A paper describes a structure:
Neutralizing antibodies that recognize the SARS-CoV-2 spike glycoprotein are the principal host defense against viral invasion. That is, immune escape and receptor binding exert competing selective pressures on the evolution of the SARS-CoV-2 spike protein, which is both the viral receptor-binding and fusion protein and the sole known target of protective antibodies (Abs). The ACE2 binding surface (“RBD-2”) harbored the binding sites of the neutralizing antibodies with highest potency but with the greatest sensitivity to viral escape; two other epitopic regions on the RBD (“RBD-1 and “RBD-3”) bound antibodies of more modest potency but greater breadth. We determined structures for prefusion stabilized spike ectodomain trimer bound with Fab fragments of three mAbs (G32A4, C98C7, and G32Q4), two of which (C98C7 and G32Q4) neutralized all variants, while the third (G32A4) neutralized all except Omicron BA.1.
One antibody from each of the three RBD epitopic regions (G32R7, C98C7, and G32Q4, in competition clusters RBD-1, -2 and -3, respectively) neutralized all five variants of concern in a pseudovirus assay; the same three also neutralized authentic SARS-CoV-2 Omicron BA.1. The epitopes of C98C7 and G32A4, both in the RBD-2 group, overlapped the ACE2 footprint; related Abs compete with ACE2 ( 2 ). G32A4 and C98C7 belong to well-studied public classes, which dominate the RBD-2-cluster; G32Q4 showed a convergence of structure and recognition with a published antibody encoded by completely different VH and VL gene segments. The immune-escape mutations in the beta, gamma, and Omicron BA.1 variants fell within the footprint of RBD-2-cluster antibody C98C7. Nonetheless, unlike other Abs with heavy chains encoded by IGHV1-53/66, such as C93D9, C98C7 retained some binding and neutralizing potency for all the variants, including Omicron BA.1. C98C7 is unusual among RBM-binding, IGHV3-53/66 Abs in retaining affinity for the Omicron BA.1 variant spike protein. A characteristic of this public class is a short HCDR3 loop projecting toward Lys417, the site of the K417N/T mutation common to beta, gamma, and Omicron BA. Third hypervariable loops longer than about 11-12 residues would probably collide with the RBD if the antibody docked as defined by its germline encoded HCDR1 and HCDR2. The equilibrium dissociation constants for the C98C7 and G32Q4 Fabs (22 and 1.8 μM, respectively) were consistent with the diminished, but measurable neutralizing potencies of the corresponding mAbs. The structures, binding, and neutralization data presented here show that just two or three mutations at key positions in the SARS-CoV-2 spike protein can strongly diminish the capacity of RBD-binding Abs from an unbiased panel to neutralize variants such as beta, gamma, and Omicron BA.
Numbering used by the authors:
A (entry chain H): 1 to 219
B (entry chain L): 2 to 214
C (entry chain A): 334 to 528
Write the structure that this text describes.
């Protein structure tokens, strides 16, 4: 019966502007230390900015001046307005109620921001066909690779989506080219690698592409 | 102000005790510092405000301690819901989180495997090649993988990926991928990836000649 | 000559910032100055007139608000910035000429094992207009429900404690701060030094 609505993810070019929405339930944002923090992709947890009960902002020293934290007391909203963005600021952003001696106690769902010079682009699917290397005890490991998609997120599902156990979907990685890529692998019996109904399924919303592609043995 | 968080990582068994030693660069007071718990992906909640003052909903099984050079969060009897990554932050001018301390399930050491998936013509005719080196359900993360092509240092050209801790059985699966051109693939002959782990006594290597299936 | 700066600089009873002690005074006046800046302090910044020549202008009246804060928080005593002390515990007006003094006080104000005699208004509904002691320790309502003055989920004591151990960082030893606000009300002039 109390929470901070978080909404308004972002997919932007560097140097642009963007906005994210926080909305209190019970909390009166005009009466709190509200504060946004960010998780870089799988790296630390950096505090970003704070708006006081009264109007007063304090930003992290690495995002000084470039962002803005604003208020809508009338409709109880907290705004992240991002300006002149940069490549590394890809992150997940958290709206968080703050009680400095009691520590930030209430935290929003967090919404993802992606900053990159690249452009939305569908994936490419390449099988990872097992061989005698991945056959020991029947632990046939087979995968498919999603190369030069953009941007995160995607989903991958196998057996047309009927096999979500035994799956290993290694996260994506932002590479030198700036084009996101990843892979995903599952394990199956030795008699299964040579013959079964193998489909690996890649689904990318921004490029609205639903490739239910077939992964096969190769020679 | 800098808040290191010793040690790097802490592995534990269900029902077991725990200590996690946050350590300031300076020596500081104890009122300000707090201890947060982050689940993987979810949003960081609070555990300890003040030096050791447990907050609302915080089970008695958590205890802060210490002052000055270091503070320590401790757990009496473990529970998987307590398995998360803890960030100590000292609310000075503004929070300065420590780099965190993944808390993971102690598990009899297990042998990583290693599998190979080279690219092929369907992938070659796109002008780029990417090889796959694979490991399945090892423990712990302190594992070493390198890519020997011409038995050289193919450094930089390889991307490492590894799943999160497996809530079902607390394992680690990993992969790596080398970003070559078509010419880069054509030029060379042998490709191999080697792995050395605390789960095996030898640098197990998988090798394959180019074009050989 | 008869001036009261002693009982406010070398004092013994320094109160918390939330209830910072006003002290209106009428100084000692002769043909030479009114005080010395410092021989051993930690931070000292005087606006309008340079900190080495405070006696350069006679003042009708002053207010030497005395309190104790952290080390680095002297930063957010200066006018123009908007730290946690500036908004709720103590504001200096954005257009201000006066001075700020801050000397370390670990050797006096720090009790081993954790002193807690020093508080500061953490939460407060909105910013202070300059120089309004918000002495009221009334429960603070951050939400839609008044709490009849009893603490709850969103009903918090507004003052909190520093907690000075003796091992603290150089930026966390309690700096005893005294801030001189030089008023501009137009009466016969009292506070100054030389002829």
């Amino acid at each position: 019966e109390v929470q901070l609505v978080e909404s308004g993810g972002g997919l932007v070019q560097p140097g642009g502007s963007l906005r994210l929405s926080c909305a209190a339930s019970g909390i009166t944002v005009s009466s709190n230390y509200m504060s946004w923090v960010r998780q870089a992709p799988g790296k630390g947890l950096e505090w970003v900015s704070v708006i006081y009960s009264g109007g007063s902002t304090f930003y992290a020293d690495s995002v000084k001046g470039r962002f803005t934290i604003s208020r809508d007391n009338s409709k109880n909203t907290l705004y992240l307005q991002m300006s002149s963005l940069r490549a590394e600021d890809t992150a997940v952003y958290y709206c968080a109620r703050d009680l400095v001696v009691f520590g930030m106690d209430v935290w929003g769902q967090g919404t993802t921001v992606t900053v990159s010079s690249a452009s939305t682009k569908g994936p490419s699917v390449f099988p990872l066909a097992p061989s005698s290397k991945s056959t020991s005890g029947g632990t046939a490991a087979l995968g498919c690779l999603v190369k030069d998609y953009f941007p995160e997120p995607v989903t991958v599902s196998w057996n047309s989506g009927a096999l979500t156990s035994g799956v290993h979907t290694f996260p994506a990685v932002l590479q030198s080219s700036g084009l996101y890529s990843l892979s995903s692998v599952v394990t199956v019996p030795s008699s299964s690698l040579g013959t079964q109904t193998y489909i690996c399924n890649v689904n990318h919303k921004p490029s609205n592409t639903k490739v239910d592609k077939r992964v096969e043995p190769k020679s | 102000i800098v808040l290191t968080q010793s040690p790097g990582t802490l592995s534990l068994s269900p029902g077991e005790t725990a200590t996690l030693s946050c350590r300031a660069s300076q020596s500081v007071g104890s009122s300000y510092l707090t201890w947060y718990q982050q689940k993987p992906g979810q949003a960081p909640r609070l555990l300890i405000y003040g030096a050791s003052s447990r907050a609302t909903g915080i089970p008695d099984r958590f205890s802060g301690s210490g002052s000055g050079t270091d503070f320590t969060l401790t757990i009496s009897r473990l529970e998987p819901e307590d398995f998360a990554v803890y960030y100590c932050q000292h609310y000075g001018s503004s929070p300065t989180f420590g780099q965190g301390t993944k808390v993971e399930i102690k598990r009899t050491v297990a042998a990583p495997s290693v599998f190979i998936f080279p690219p092929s013509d369907e992938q070659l005719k796109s002008g780029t090649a990417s090889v796959v080196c694979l490991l399945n359900n090892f423990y712990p993360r302190e594992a070493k993988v390198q890519w020997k092509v011409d038995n050289a240092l193919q450094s930089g050209n390889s991307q490492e990926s590894v799943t999160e801790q497996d809530s079902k059985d607390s394992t680690y699966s990993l992969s790596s991928t080398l970003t070559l051109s078509k010419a880069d693939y054509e030029k060379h002959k042998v490709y191999a990836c080697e792995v050395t782990h605390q789960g095996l006594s030898s640098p197990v290597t998988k090798s394959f000649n180019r074009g050989e299936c | 000559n008869l001036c009261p700066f002693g009982e406010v600089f070398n004092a013994t009873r320094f109160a918390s910032v939330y209830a910072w002690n006003r002290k209106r005074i009428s100084n000692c006046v002769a043909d030479y100055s009114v005080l010395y800046n410092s021989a051993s302090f930690s931070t000292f910044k005087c606006y309008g007139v340079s900190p080495t020549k405070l006696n350069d202008l006679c003042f009708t009246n002053v207010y030497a608000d005395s309190f104790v804060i952290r080390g680095d928080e002297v930063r957010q005593i200066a006018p123009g910035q908007t730290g946690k002390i500036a908004d709720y515990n103590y504001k200096l007006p954005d257009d201000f000429t006066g001075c700020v003094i801050a000397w370390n006080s670990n050797n006096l104000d720090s009790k081993v094992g954790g002193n807690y005699n020093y508080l500061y208004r953490l939460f407060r509904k909105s910013n202070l207009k300059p120089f309004e002691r918000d002495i009221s320790t009334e429960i603070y309502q951050a939400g839609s429900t008044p709490c009849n003055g009893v603490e709850g989920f969103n009903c918090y004591f507004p003052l909190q404690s520093y907690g000075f151990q003796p091992t603290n960082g150089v930026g966390y030893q309690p700096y005893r701060v005294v801030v001189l606000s030089f008023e501009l009300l137009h009466a016969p002039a009292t506070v100054c030094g030389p002829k």
